[PDB]
A = this chain, B = another copy of it.
Amino acid sequence: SGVDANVSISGAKVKLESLAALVNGAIAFDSPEESKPAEAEDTFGLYEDLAHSQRGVIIKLELPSGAGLTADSTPLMYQGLEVGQLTKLDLNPGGKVTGEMTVDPSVVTLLRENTRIELRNPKLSLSDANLSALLTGKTFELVPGDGEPRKEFVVVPGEKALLHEPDVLTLTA
């Protein structure tokens, strides 16, 4: 329901909904193949948008600071592709910042112990001046590990990525 603009970098297009959907509002719904049929005034939850209705797994993140992070625009990268999307970004008492993220199921098997997640930063490449990276701002990164599945993670700064590794030679900017 309602209509907005969808502005994208280096070109844009604006198509959201049908005329009746805007004059009157509307709902849409999807049905999993395997579930059982609901009945008898069974309650359900409405999601404000198709994006928020996406069926992905939830991950809790303890963050250093959400300086450039945005609650529904910051993506998760892997092999150059978006797989996940930050969903919630909140301040806890004591100054700690915590968020929660959605991930596509196709990658969830990679989420295991010694799987680290690092905030990358858009770098000023001398060779390939990548404008889109600069415009996007901060972005996370996935780097799979091996071990038991886990769902709570601590995000590491991109600088300290080498430090938080299974194997690394630490000596005593």
Residues of chain A whose beta carbon lies under 8 Å from any beta carbon of chain B: 2-15, 18-19, 22-23, 65-69, 73, 78-81, 83, 89, 91, 93, 95-97, 106-107, 109, 121-124, 127-132, 134-137, 144
Name the distance in Å between A91's Cβ and chain B's nearest Cβ.
Answer: 6
Task: Report which residue of A6, A80, A124 has the largest number of chain B beta carbons within 10 angstroms of its beta carbon.
Answer: A80
Q: Which residues of B contact A10 (CB under 8 A)?
A: 9, 135-137
Q: Which residues of B contact A18 (CB under 8 A)?
A: 2
A168 to B10, CA, bound (A): 38
Chain multiplicity (copies): 2
Q: Which residues of B contact A79 (CB under 8 A)?
A: 65-66, 91, 95-97
A interface majority secondary structure: loop
25 contacts between A and B (CB under 8 A): A2-B18, A4-B14, A5-B12, A6-B13, A7-B11, A9-B10, A10-B136, A10-B137, A11-B73, A19-B23, A65-B79, A66-B79, A68-B130, A69-B80, A79-B91, A79-B95, A79-B97, A91-B106, A91-B107, A93-B109, A95-B144, A121-B127, A124-B127, A124-B129, A132-B137
